[PDB]
Each structure stands twice: as C-alpha cells, then as structure tokens.
C-alpha cells in the first residue's frame, strides 16, 4: 500500500506532464510562426517586439525545462524504489507482483526510455530557438517550423506504453 501508491502517483503525474507538454508546445508553435512572419515582413520590406516575442519563447522553454526536471526526479525516485525492493527482497526470491502481473523493472525501463526521448526532444527545441531568428533561407525556416511541430524524437508506440501503465494502475476502467 506504500510502493503501489507510488505507482498510483507516478502514472497520474506522467499523464499530467504529457498534457502540460502539449499545451506549452502549442504556445511555442504560435509564437514561432509569428516570429517567422515578422521576419519575412521585415526582409520583404523593430527590435522591441522581436525581442519581446523571443522573450516569451524563452519563457516557454523555461517551462519545458521545469517539466523535464520533474520528469528526471520522478524517474530517479522510481529507480530508488525498485532498488529498495530489490535490496529488501533479496536475490533468490520469487516475488509476487504488486498488481496482477507486472514486476517493477518493467516500470523502470518504461520511465527510462520516456525520459531519454523527451530529453533529446528538448535539446532539439533549444537549437531551433537559437537558430530561428537569424536565418534567411525560407526552406530552412519551413524545416525549423516543421521540427517544432512534428517532434521527431518522440515516437508513437510509447503512447501505447503509457497506456500499459494505465492498465497497471487502474485510472482507466477495465
């Protein structure tokens, strides 16, 4: 009722963090599309509203950095409770599962691969926010906006994996 409640907290906090990542990504895409439209209206034809738009893009990136910090500490305490159970139950022990079937090392690998994917995607977003306001080739501008929108380091099947914890916690009805 202690470790299982930590799984109950961890799956719900995972789902809530994915929802706030999607809201911040929509705000960032609207600000970046306005930045590119202001740049092409500059070059086809100033620093205050361009600096203001770059500053709210920086505030969006700071919010995503805070979400990644909470992701890293959630995976770290999941690693800590799996190592605590592995130290407490000994080596040669056939452990019954906390829910019906799954052991806790599967939760550790799910959290590790989700953490790796979102950590790579945040670094690509920092490079896009570095290089967006200075470039002049419009194909590269469309490529940078497509890298913001389509998120090429976040894979689709990991959503299926998130729903596996939603059938290991029970927030969704069986």
């Amino acid at each position: 009722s202690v470790s299982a409640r930590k799984i109950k907290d961890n799956a719900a906090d995972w789902h809530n963090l994915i929802l706030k990542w999607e809201t911040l990504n929509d705000a960032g895409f609207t600000t970046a599309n306005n930045i590119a439209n202001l740049k092409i209206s500059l070059l086809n034809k100033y620093n205050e509203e361009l600096e203001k738009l770059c500053e709210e893009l920086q505030a969006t990136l700071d919010g995503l950095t805070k979400i990644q910090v909470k992701m890293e500490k959630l995976s770290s305490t999941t690693k800590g409770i799996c190592e605590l159970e592995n130290y407490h139950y000994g080596e040669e022990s056939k452990r019954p599962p906390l829910f019906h079937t799954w052991p806790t090392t599967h939760f550790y690998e799910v959290s590790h691969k989700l953490l790796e994917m979102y950590r790579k995607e945040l670094l690509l977003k920092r490079t896009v926010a570095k290089e967006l306001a200075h470039t002049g080739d419009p194909d590269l501008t469309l490529s940078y906006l497509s890298m913001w929108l389509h998120q090429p380091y976040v894979e689709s099947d990991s959503r299926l994996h998130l729903e596996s914890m939603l059938l290991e916690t029970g927030h969704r009805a069986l």
């Binding site: 361009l50 600096e51 770059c54 893009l57 920086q58 926010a129 570095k130 967006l132 306001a133 200075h134």
Partner: peptide, 26 residues
C-alpha cells in the same frame, strides 16, 4: 557576462579594464 542576442546566448570573459583615471588592472 551573459547577453541574449535575439535568443542566442553569449558567454563573455573579461580580460582587462582600463578606466577613466588611467589606472589599468593586471
């Protein structure tokens, strides 16, 4: 010193300051 030129962060390292009274540093 840290300045953000249009989103790009810059790292500046100060080597020498020469002031108004003519006294320089090392």
């Amino acid at each position: 010193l840290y300045c953000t030129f249009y989103g790009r962060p810059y790292k500046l390292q100060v080597l020498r300051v020469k002031g108004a009274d003519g006294m320089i540093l090392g």
